[PDB]
Amino acid sequence: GSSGSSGRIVGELEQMVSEDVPLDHRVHARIIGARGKAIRKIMDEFKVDIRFPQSGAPDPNCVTVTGLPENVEEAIDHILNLEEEYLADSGPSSG
């Protein structure tokens, strides 16, 4: 007898909301992974759909994430978290 929804859910497609998360291109691949796995676990985690900016994208530093407004928000916080951690290790290579 819980107030409203009792268990977790995915929601409706239309119900989902597209958001823009400011992600540095220096942490893009690092997050995406090799075959898109590192980003696969994150998506399923919050059940969202992260859409990285393509080469001809207007914002190569912004990623479009789809999904409920309650799940997306959480995903973002997790995204920026990895951004910093990764950045921390950014040194000017010889060439």
Phi, psi (degrees; rounded to nearest 5) at 27: -120, 10
Cβ neighbours of residue 39 under 8 Å, at least 6 residues apart?
31, 32, 33, 50, 52
Rounded to whole angstroms, the Cα distance separating 94 from 37 reads 30
Tell me how the structure was determined. NMR
Q: Put the strands of the sheet holding 49-51 in their side by side order.
A: 19-22, 62-66, 49-51
Q: At what angle do helices 69-87 and 38-46 cross, to 10 degrees?
A: 150
CA distances from 93 to 27, 30, 89, 90 (A): 16, 17, 11, 9
Cβ–Cβ < 8 Å for 18, 71: no
Domains of the chain (ranges plus CATH)?
1-95 (3.30.1370.10)
CA distances from 6 to 15, 59, 82 (A): 19, 39, 31
Q: Which of 20, 60, 67 is nearest to 42 (CA)?
A: 67
Rounded to whole angstroms, the Cα distance separating 11 from 16 reads 7
Dihedral of CA 71/42/93/56: which sign? negative
